[PDB]
Design a protein around this ligand. Structure first.
Ligand SMILES: OC[C@H]1O[C@@H](O)[C@H](O)[C@@H](O)[C@H]1O
Ligand SMILES: OC[C@H]1O[C@@H](O)[C@H](O)[C@@H](O)[C@H]1O
Ligand SMILES: OC[C@H]1O[C@@H](O)[C@H](O)[C@@H](O)[C@H]1O
Lengths: 16, 133, 133, 16, 133, 15, 15, 133
């Protein structure tokens, strides 16, 4: 994997 | 617009934003919690001026993020975030901006908002939220 | 209506639902993944009949939901879920039901839907989703 | 608090 | 030996294991909690017999494992798990097996064991634990 | 429920 | 991938 | 000793420590990653001097800790952390301090060490680690 911690991300709301 | 990404923190202490009653959300800045201390997030500024500022100071940690809602719509040819409302376990902060276009709502049953990312040009183009337990 | 809570699993293999083009979403049931094997969740049935059945069979694990959207609206005085759309990295399933009322959308940039909870009477009253990395 | 695992939960959309 | 992997669940209700007071841990089996219901995990077995069975029945959900400790050592030229101890917030279960070789200890300040994986030949070669909030 | 984010913590090792 | 993951500690024993 | 708690971060860029072969770990300080930026954690210093300094610079983000191991033992009537070893997917850093006393090991198959807490008096009395996906 990688040394970067992950987090749930919701969205995007708006353009696209 | 100019994309921004604050990343993940341990909570929210304060949200600073600006809006215009004829257009949309302009500025966006967050004072996050970082392991018990305030962490002042970078100020994400609109390319233009003329906005009304608002400070949402939360009673951290007892007050917290239970719902984020708002409206997306067309402003001068662009699809942008026209309004935002932040609802806590204690109070409703908003609506800020123009409540016109298409609604969106993110209610939370379990977990917290711990970060923001998105893009701002003349207005807040879009945004996303980092969620954690 | 009758509340339900499937709880959390390791992914989604299939969503089985029912709708009526005049009213709202009826039945709702999910085949989850549980540690690489299917797990048939409880069938959550409407108190009435006359619904059009739909089977959303996912190409698990390479295909996963990236957005859940729909509409909430009044049907016979009750606030219910009138339509649902499931957007994956491979296909769009829906809309199923009536695209009338208040739109809602839950796009996901990182993480997975791993469970569903809600309530069903004559129609799907409400629903929530379990999110996990 | 108890031996039950927890998860992020988003919603409800619809009634209540 | 033969690798096993139970995957992840929502908690632990029972641990059924076997040991020999002169060798190491033999069989290993877990009754998990799966969203408020018992889920009987597969019984992972030694390729030999002569072990003493032990049933560690937990008062789920108020009772949960806070520490797993034990010993790894050489039995007939093979490095195996010789002993296991399970400390809950209510009581200490063990040591089962041989308190000889190299000790290990997994104390948990926050979070829960929600699954087991490992390998068994004549004895438990190794094991790992799934942790979750 | 609290406004502070949580993380799995393992340990302590030592005293 | 569509498979949720979990923190895994170990292995203790033969490496 | 003096209790410390750095809290949780996005990752680890550098570990600074000190040790003395006749005693134990003296110093402990971490340079974390906070959303792509190094974040210098507080220096958790021993009440005394005479330690050999150690800098463990990681090739973040490709290089990360897969195992923390060490030894606890009685030094001047106190149970302290006498030795530490950090193994990454690249190399083994340590042992730092003598490999004598009660060993401990925290190997990780999935997830990351995202923070440290503990206590330092004359030596590192104890420590815990924050783990996250
Ligand atoms: O905010 C609306 C728009 O503002 C402009 O200044 C920018 O060039 C566009 O890409 C869009 O962001
Ligand atoms: O679904 C709409 C309604 O259906 C009824 O049967 C039920 O009693 C109500 O509580 C509500 O759920
Ligand atoms: O590090 C070993 C010890 O160091 C002393 O100075 C302190 O008073 C003790 O509480 C313990 O921390």
């Amino acid at each position: 994997q990688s040394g970067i911690s992950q987090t749930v991300i919701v969205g995007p709301w708006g353009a696209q | 617009g100019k994309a921004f990404d604050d990343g993940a923190f341990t909570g929210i202490r304060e949200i600073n934003l600006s809006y215009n009653k004829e257009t949309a959300i302009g500025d966006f800045q967050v004072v996050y919690d970082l392991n018990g201390s305030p962490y002042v997030g970078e100020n994400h500024k609109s390319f233009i001026t003329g906005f009304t500022p608002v400070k949402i100071s939360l009673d951290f940690p007892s007050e917290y993020i239970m719902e984020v809602s708002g409206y997306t719509g067309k402003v001068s040819g662009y699809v942008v975030v026209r309004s935002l409302t932040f609802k806590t376990n204690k109070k409703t902060y908003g609506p800020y901006g123009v409540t016109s276009g298409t609604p969106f709502s993110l209610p939370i049953e379990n977990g917290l908002i711990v970060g923001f990312k998105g893009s701002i040009g003349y207005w807040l183009d879009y945004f996303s939220m980092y969620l954690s337990l």
